[PDB]
Amino acid sequence: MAWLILIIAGIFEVVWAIALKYSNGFTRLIPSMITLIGMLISFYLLSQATKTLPIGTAYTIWTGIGALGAVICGIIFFKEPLTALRIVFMILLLTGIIGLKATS
Amino acid sequence: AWLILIIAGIFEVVWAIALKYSNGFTRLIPSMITLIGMLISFYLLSQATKTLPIGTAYTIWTGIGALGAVICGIIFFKEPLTALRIVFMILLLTGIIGLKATS
Amino acid sequence: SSVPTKLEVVAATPTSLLISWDAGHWWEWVTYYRITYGETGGNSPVQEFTVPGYSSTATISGLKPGVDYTITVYAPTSDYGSPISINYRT
Amino acid sequence: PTKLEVVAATPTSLLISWDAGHWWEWVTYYRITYGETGGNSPVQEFTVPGYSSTATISGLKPGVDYTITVYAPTSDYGSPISINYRT
Numbered sequence: 001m002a003w004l005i006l007i008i009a010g011i012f013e014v015v016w017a018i019a020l021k022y023s024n025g026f027t028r029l030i031p032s033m034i035t036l037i038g039m040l041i042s043f044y045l046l047s048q049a050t051k052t053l054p055i056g057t058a059y060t061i062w063t064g065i066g067a068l069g070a071v072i073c074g075i076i077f078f079k080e081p082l083t084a085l086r087i088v089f090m091i092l093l094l095t096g097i098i099g100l101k102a103t104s
Numbered sequence: 105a106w107l108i109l110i111i112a113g114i115f116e117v118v119w120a121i122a123l124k125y126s127n128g129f130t131r132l133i134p135s136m137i138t139l140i141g142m143l144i145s146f147y148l149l150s151q152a153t154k155t156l157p158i159g160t161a162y163t164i165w166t167g168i169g170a171l172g173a174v175i176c177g178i179i180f181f182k183e184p185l186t187a188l189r190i191v192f193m194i195l196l197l198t199g200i201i202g203l204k205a206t207s
Numbered sequence: 208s209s210v211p212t213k214l215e216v217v218a219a220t221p222t223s224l225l226i227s228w229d230a231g232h233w234w235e236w237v238t239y240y241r242i243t244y245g246e247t248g249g250n251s252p253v254q255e256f257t258v259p260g261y262s263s264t265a266t267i268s269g270l271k272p273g274v275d276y277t278i279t280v281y282a283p284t285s286d287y288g289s290p291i292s293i294n295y296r297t
Numbered sequence: 298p299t300k301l302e303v304v305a306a307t308p309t310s311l312l313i314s315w316d317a318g319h320w321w322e323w324v325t326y327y328r329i330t331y332g333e334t335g336g337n338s339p340v341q342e343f344t345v346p347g348y349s350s351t352a353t354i355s356g357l358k359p360g361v362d363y364t365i366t367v368y369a370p371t372s373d374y375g376s377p378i379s380i381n382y383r384t
């Protein structure tokens with residue numbers, strides 16, 4: 001259950017990471033509100049997760065979800081290079097996350 | 105800007121430990137340390153990325169962040185140290201670092 | 208019974224009260240307290256506001272003179288301690 | 298922004314408005330500045346949040362021609378919008 005919370009926080013991570021660049025110098029209203037709401041939601045869920053989850057696992061899995069979603073959305077939405085190297089890195093990241101959830 | 109980036113990662117680990125100490129953003133000071141150790145990291149990273157390649161800067165930043173969270177966790181909160189968990193954590197850390205080193 | 212401690216009315220008024228408490232030691236401070244106050248006879252509801260955790264004092268206003276009230280100060284959760292409550296007639 | 302109109306005017310105040318755009322154009326804030334058209338002393342100014350499209354300017358000398366400029370957060374939008382108006 002805390003893992004569900006962790007995954008959702010990792011989602012909001014990438015949503016605010018990309019709305020931050022779509023917002024300019026924190027100037028565009030809609031993207032700035034999206035970033036602020038996403039930051040608050042993400043950090044809150046991360047805290048509630050770390051209450052019952054170890055900090056060393058929760059932090060790195062949150063970072064992994066964030067960067068994985070960033071690369072998913074970059075390859076899909078920004079025509080970013082879909083390198084085979086990037087594919088195998090995504091495999092490494094996902095296997096790490098799932099294996100960390102398996103040994104709970 | 106190398107050591108300013110090293111410090112930007114150390115403060116990432118700092119707010120990780122503080123957040124675990126805050127018990128859901130309820131204990132004042134661990135919540136406050138958590139909040140203040142984050143804009144330090146981002147502003148120091150903006151000043152480092154102002155000098156260093158955004159790629160390598162971000163990669164080293166998040167690498168220190170993740171690995172230090174792991175290590176300081178197995179200490180302050182007696183978090184585990186299984187041969188299995190270190191393997192999957194190595195997989196995750198290399199995956200993140202590699203995906204960041206490419207863009 | 209760790210936090211909060213020593214809930215007391217500093218100053219008073221027919222319509223207002225000034226309350227304070229002992230936050231505790233620096234490892235006991237919380238991000239926010241919530242203060243609940245109501246007519247002690249229970250006309251019906253209880254009013255509530257929240258106060259930043261770095262404030263040991265709060266000011267409750269808009270009360271009816273002569274009526275007895277109960278004021279309670281809570282921690283964010285129940286793990287810290289039990290909410291301390293008092294009684295006071297305006 | 299665009300369409301800086303003086304919606305209303307008493308001898309001592311101007312109520313102005315503008316078109317905020319739509320959705321992907323709403324900025325976080327606008328900055329209104331008003332001063333005697335061709336003065337010598339510091340201009341006046343205030344700032345409103347981006348969701349609002351109107352603004353009230355008050356405390357003006359009656360019968361004087363003032364200029365009003367509504368500014369965006371940065372320059373990368375739609376250029377300043379300025380008008381002149383005598384009370």
